[PDB]
């Protein structure tokens, strides 16, 4: 089974360089071209370059000359992309992809690497419970939620009952204000089930090595 495993999210300061990786498995590494593309938050795709590890050969987007360089290590079946003189313009998700053959497109994809170029410091979120206040909310169903406030950088991962509560969940995209992000998550369950069968939100923020759980209580 062909897999392309990319390295973890990066938070780095402008003017530095970062080296991100794409570990391949399931096929002969030297035999296939790998391509790299850039996707800026809320943007489309931009092509950076292709690398043939059996060569090593590369074909590159001259719009990135001096910004990006592609290399590969045959011994560990890993392709790298080095980005330098970083700016907020470089803040993107970077993907690697295998060219399946002779101009046949990318048949396997990495999960992407998020790079965030900021002088801003990492800040963990505040998680607040959202329980119905004054106004007997519906009856047949009941909606609960969690407010996740004031973190940096993206993302956070929200779950309910550690993932076992997945139906009727809406996790909203974050809004960025005063260098910090805020998101909410709603969950709707049958009324007869709460607070009888507990409902807890779990918010993971990898950058700050933090997780916080809030049980929603009446």
């Amino acid at each position: 089974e062909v897999q392309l495993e990319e390295s973890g999210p990066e938070l780095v300061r402008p003017g530095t360089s970062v080296k991100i990786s794409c570990k391949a498995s399931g096929y002969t590494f030297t035999n296939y071209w790998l391509g790299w593309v850039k996707q800026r938050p809320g943007h489309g795709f931009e092509w950076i370059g292709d690398i043939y590890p059996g060569g090593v050969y590369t074909t590159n987007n001259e719009k990135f000359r001096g910004k990006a360089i592609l290399t590969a290590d045959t011994s560990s079946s890993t392709a790298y992309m080095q980005l330098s003189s970083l700016t907020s313009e470089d803040s993107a998700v970077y993907f690697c992809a295998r060219a399946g053959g002779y101009y046949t497109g990318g048949d396997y994809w990495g999960q992407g690497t998020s790079v965030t170029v900021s002088s801003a410091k990492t800040t963990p979120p505040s998680v607040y419970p959202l329980a119905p206040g004054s106004a007997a909310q519906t009856n047949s169903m009941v909606t609960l939620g969690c407010l996740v406030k004031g973190y940096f950088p993206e993302p956070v991962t929200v779950t309910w009952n550690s993932g076992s509560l997945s139906s009727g969940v809406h996790t909203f995209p974050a809004v960025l204000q005063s260098d910090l992000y805020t998101l909410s998550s709603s969950v709707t369950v049958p009324s007869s089930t709460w607070p009888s069968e507990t409902v807890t939100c779990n918010v993971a923020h990898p950058a700050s090595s933090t997780k916080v759980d809030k049980k929603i209580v009446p």
């Binding site: 001259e62 497109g105 999960q111």
Partner: protein
Amino acid sequence: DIVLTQAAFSNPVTLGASASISCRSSKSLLNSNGIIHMYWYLQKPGQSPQLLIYQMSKLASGAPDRFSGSGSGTDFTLRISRVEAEDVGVYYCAQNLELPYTFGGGTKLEIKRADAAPTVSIFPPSSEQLTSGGASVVCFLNNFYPKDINVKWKIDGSERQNGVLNSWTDQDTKDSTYSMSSTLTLTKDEYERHNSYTCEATHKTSTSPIVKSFNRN
């Protein structure tokens, strides 16, 4: 640059009906060897892109044969014979004839389904936040269609615009609805100077707003 032009938006398409996406190339994508260098990718939110069509009209392994491609050497069309709800996302064209390789700007596919009114819920600040001197009042407007919707906040019956932040989900891949959160963020001081907090939803499914409220006391 070989420039690939795509509309960011497409008309909403009924479940089971046909859809078409177009892409236009500023230069012919035909090679001396006969290949037409046109590729179509789909990308779903939070996912890596998926190859559907290669060399203008060849079906990628893993792509359902509902997907099909054609074109001349400059105008290309991606077609979906029968659209499914899970097909929502952004469709990209791409070329590798000439350097630099390029992508078109992507076209978002949307499903047309029967209108649905939002389910609205309001929540007051938590004790935990108030302790910190903050007071956010949250309103969820879930599972509605169509996407167009407006929210109005009122404090002690006066309309409030300042300190309101809105966020919309992407179209649901299963029920083809939309959801929206609206958050009014005040300081504790301001929150404590008023009593009634109201969120009102106005949507095409009714001439009457959907009103949810609470009173601090």
